[PDB]
Design a binder for these strands. Structure first.
Ligand SMILES: Cc1ccnc2c1ncn2[C@H]1C[C@H](O)[C@@H](COP(=O)(O)OP(=O)(O)OP(=O)(O)O)O1
Ligand SMILES: [Ca+2]
Ligand SMILES: [Ca+2]
Ligand SMILES: [Ca+2]
Ligand SMILES: [Ca+2]
Ligand SMILES: [Ca+2]
Length: 903
DNA sequence: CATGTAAGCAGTCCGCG
DNA sequence: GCGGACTGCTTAC
């Protein structure tokens, strides 16, 4: 097999590399790497190295990496550019793996672990590590085994061995319901004392050294706890055995509270699953406890136990250990679904970077572009210092707030990367400038053509049309991968709807799920077989289609994120190729494109409807337009449609056969106007929206920019079995909105859009009557809590103190000197509740850590003093009044003359 | 050592015979 | 009690 790296580190003048050799064996080597950098040299000198602008360079080969760094500083002092890759381990990887890396994940050791630490005096701080580690579960991906290290004797209690037989039993039979599929994979190791547990764990670690190290919150808890605990017991050198190179870096961050540490383990790639999740999931959660995320991702119930975690080991050691095991497994289950470890590996090896560098789009692109340019013997420019400078972004149309009955939307494919490719935007393709007219003159096609020679953006930039740019070249490759995966995702989604349709008439038979590839639209013959399947098989097929869809979503959305990240990187001062001319060439072109096509669509639809000057495009944001389709439907007349699906088919055909060609003609003309390299402005129909035929539903509404709701029948070619709400920006979409309120507001919208005013009023009346009976957590607001200390004046709110911060301070006083209460962690999320006047908490609100029950001692008072009136008004009534006033609807029946009668 | 900007809404402070 | 300037937070793209 071809060789591939596992990890790389620079330590002084040495590169330390863990890798897989040609026989599939794990190896380590220390290489005294001799790096090269470059300096501009006189033309006359015959060299083979050129910078990106074609200026000749001379190579400087250094005896070691220190000399190379020292030369960089001398060059800075002289005032001349020091060219080449200055992160030498990227140079090392590029030199060592001068081919496309094909890695074998079954050879890469992926470790998932977590630890337990009983603490009778508050949260066990990793920086102090003053309490025994009393459980470790460490799953190894090569062994496919859960190694369980269990402390039997502790200063906090002596306990019996954990029982695998009891662990396997149903909870309803007093067991722990450790999943049956992992019972046989558990290797259980009890220990009589912590020192031997830890020594054995370290020996184990030596035998089975993680390459990728992950788990839930490992970077801020488990890792520094383990490291510091070992340091305290055995000494720092022993603790450094966690690094295969025996080298660590300890980073301490302090504030007006305590101080935590992050530990860098050289030779390991730590990918905390919480960080992966935040980056790659495109959710925003109200809590990031593993209980909450597992429930959200997998629909499994919270791991329940009685009493405080500080007493769980002594009262129920059996459950304590089982829950440690299940917690490690849940992260594996989330990853089986989401496939973020897979994505990280793909991206890391594609770029030739340390795997943990996938968190940095700047590092990822620097490496990609470096490798691309190195192939052509080109020399990359020196990174420079740039002052931060705001710059203009996209255009958003101001909508008229209203109900909108029939809506069709259109969206440009991968807009910013498509602009890069169309215009040919790259550091080395800049041809010059032209004198700009106001943007409106380009939009209306009245400005003079910018150039008949170069490819242009309305920001004044010109680019060469006849040569390739590294940015367009490399962005296209990732774009093409993204497109492939998005196709798989959409196919799986269409396939799901086929299965949901067939679930309306399940067959009474004993059969099996069909063996199919869900990434491809089902054939007619598969559709025939599906129509004869039982509910059981259909449901299993539906689960599999949805899992296929999720896998496709991970793959495409994060590749989209990467390419869009390149367009944003051009506007980040830390990017080697930072250049506002290019960042701005993109955003300004986008503004033109949106507003140009708005004009073209208005013109086209007025023409085909035989009218003049009417506004069809009601809204647009960045690269999308929303077209009112009322006049289209009225042109033929609603009477003519047999059912909802009929008018949906009609609009679908209209968009594809009439509008899209006109949109295409409009953009091809724009491309000629800007004299661009390649026409890539591809704007396809997205949503078809409307009320069910014959109902009193309003179809959709806008309240303002970035705030709307639509009843959707078809989305990007997926014809839904059941209409689906597309809601953007409204409180239902915000993680700060209480859970039960999100639910209630969404049902309010559903009723407005599908059923009408009366249906809304009936629901509102019910919700208002039942509000007070909802669980307090379901109705609590949520907020992130930054700069808590900043506003903390002897436990009381300083000036301008935010509401949620005030709640935290109220909480801190309520739990003061009471060691069993969970602390609010800076930058994390809190539940928030308003309090009625005169409450024993001495203030107007309380806040506590999100995803948790409020501590038992103050829970009773919170429940008694909660201000339901304020809560209902702020979180529910006020947003709903926004929705209904925009929609020209009432959520409560208004008074009228009819009130004089007895109905 | 590290993607971007646009923009809505809740909240605090201040002005208000 | 509300609106205007301002911060904080969060979402749309
Ligand atoms: C998250 C994020 C970071 C940086 N830029 C972002 C972004 N989301 C959108 N944008 C910018 C770049 C996008 O090209 C543009 C339009 O957003 P949109 O979400 O339409 O995505 P787009 O890239 O066009 O991909 P599709 O093919 O799925 O439509 O808005
Ligand atoms: Ca635990
Ligand atoms: Ca788009
Ligand atoms: Ca599309
Ligand atoms: Ca059937
Ligand atoms: Ca869009």
């Amino acid at each position: 097999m071809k060789e591939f790296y596992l990890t790389v580190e620079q330590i002084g003048d040495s590169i330390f590399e863990r890798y897989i050799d040609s026989n599939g064996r794990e190896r380590t080597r220390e290489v005294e790497y001799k790096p090269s950098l470059f300096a501009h040299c006189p033309e006359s000198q015959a060299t083979k190295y050129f910078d990106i602008y074609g200026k000749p360079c001379t190579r400087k080969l250094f005896a070691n990496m220190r000399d190379a760094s020292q030369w960089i500083k001398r060059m800075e002092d002289i005032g001349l550019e020091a060219l080449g890759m200055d992160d030498f381990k990227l140079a090392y990887l590029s030199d060592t793996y001068n081919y496309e890396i094909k890695y074998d994940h079954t050879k890469i050791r992926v470790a998932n672990f977590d630890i337990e630490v009983t603490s009778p005096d508050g949260f066990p701080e990793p920086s102090q590590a003053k309490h025994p580690i009393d459980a470790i579960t460490h799953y190894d991906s090569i062994d496919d085994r859960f190694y369980v290290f269990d402390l039997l004797n502790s200063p906090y209690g002596n306990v019996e061995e954990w029982s695998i037989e009891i662990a396997a039993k149903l909870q309803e039979q007093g067991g722990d319901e450790v999943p049956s599929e992992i019972i046989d994979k558990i290797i259980y190791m009890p220990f009589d004392n912590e020192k031997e547990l830890l020594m054995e764990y370290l020996n184990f670690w030596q035998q089975k050294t993680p390459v990728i190290l992950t788990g839930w919150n490992v970077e801020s808890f488990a890792i520094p706890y383990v490291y510091n605990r070992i340091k305290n017991i055995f000494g720092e050198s022993t603790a450094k055995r966690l690094s295969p190179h025996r080298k660590t870096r300890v980073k301490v961050i302090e504030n007006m509270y305590g101080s935590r540490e992050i530990i860098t383990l050289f030779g390991i790639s730590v990918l905390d699953y919480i960080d992966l999740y935040k980056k790659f999931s495109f959710t925003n959660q109200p809590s990031y406890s593993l209980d909450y995320i597992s429930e959200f991702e997998l629909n499994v119930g919270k791991l329940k136990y009685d009493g405080p975690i500080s007493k769980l080991r002594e009262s129920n050691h059996q459950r304590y250990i089982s829950y440690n095991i299940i917690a490690v497994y849940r992260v594996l289950q989330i990853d089986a679904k989401r496939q973020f470890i897979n994505l990280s590996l793909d991206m890391g090896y594609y770029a030739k970077i340390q795997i943990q560098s996938v968190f940095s789009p700047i590092k990822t692109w620097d490496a990609i572009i470096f490798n691309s340019l190195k192939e052509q013997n080109k020399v990359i420019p020196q990174g420079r210092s740039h002052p931060v400078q705001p710059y203009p972004g996209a255009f958003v149309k101001e909508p008229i707030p209203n109900r909108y009955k029939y809506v069709m939307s259109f969206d440009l494919t991968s807009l910013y990367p498509s602009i890069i490719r169309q215009v040919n935007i790259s550091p080395e393709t800049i041809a010059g400038t032209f004198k700009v007219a106001p943007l409106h003159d380009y939009i209306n096609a009245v400005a003079e053509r910018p150039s008949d020679v170069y490819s242009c953006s309305p920001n004044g930039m010109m680019y060469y049309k006849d040569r390739d740019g590294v940015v367009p070249t490399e962005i296209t490759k990732v774009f093409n991968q993204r497109k492939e995966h998005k196709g798989y995702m959409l196919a799986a989604q269409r396939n799901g709807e086929i299965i949901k349709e067939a679930l309306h008439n399940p067959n009474l038979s004993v059969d099996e799920p069909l063996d199919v590839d869900y990434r491809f639209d089902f054939s007619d013959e598969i559709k025939e077989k599906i129509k004869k399947l039982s509910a059981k098989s259909l449901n299993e097929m539906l689960f599999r289609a949805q899992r296929t869809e999720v896998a496709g979503m991970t793959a495409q959305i994060n590749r989209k994120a990467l390419i869009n990240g390149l367009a944003g990187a051009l506007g980040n001062v830390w990017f080697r190729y930072y250049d506002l001319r290019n960042a701005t060439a993109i955003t300004t072109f986008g503004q033109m494109a949106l507003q140009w096509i708005e004009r073209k669509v208005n013109e086209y639809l007025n023409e085909v409807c035989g009218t003049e000057g009417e506004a069809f495009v009601l809204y647009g944001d960045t690269d999308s337009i929303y077209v009112s389709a009322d006049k289209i439907i009225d042109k033929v007349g609603e009477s003519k449609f047999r059912d909802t699906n009929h008018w949906v088919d009609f609009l679908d055909k209209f968009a594809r056969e009439r509008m899209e060609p006109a949109i295409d003609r409009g953009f091809r003309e724009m491309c000629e106007y800007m004299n661009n390299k390649q026409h890539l402005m591809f704007m396809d129909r997205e949503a078809i929206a409307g009320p069910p035929l014959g109902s009193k539903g309003i179809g959709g509404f806008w309240t303002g920019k970035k705030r709307y709701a639509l009843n959707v029948w078809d989305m990007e070619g997926t014809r839904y079995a059941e209409p689906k709400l597309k809601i953007m920006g409204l409180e239902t979409q915000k993680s700060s909105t209480p859970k039960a309120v999100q639910k209630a507001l969404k049902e309010c919208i559903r009723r407005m859009l599908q059923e009408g005013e009366e249906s809304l009023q009936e629901y509102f009346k019910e919700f208002e009557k039942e509000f007070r009976q909802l669980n307090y957590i379901s109705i609590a607001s949520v907020s992130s809590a930054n700069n808590i200390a900043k506003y903390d004046v002897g436990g009381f709110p300083g000036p301008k103190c935010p509401f949620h911060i005030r709640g935290i301070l109220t909480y801190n006083r309520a739990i003061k000197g009471n060691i069993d209460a969970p602390q609010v962690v800076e930058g994390e999320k809190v539940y928030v509740l308003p309090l009625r006047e005169g409450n024993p908490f001495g203030d107007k609100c309380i806040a506590w850590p999100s995803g948790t029950e409020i501590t038992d001692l103050i829970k009773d008072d919170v429940l008694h003093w909660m201000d339901y009136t304020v809560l209902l008004e702020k979180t529910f009534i006020k947003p709903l009044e926004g929705f209904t006033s925009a929609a020209k609807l009432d959520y409560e029946k208004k008074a009228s003359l009819f009130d004089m009668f007895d109905f």
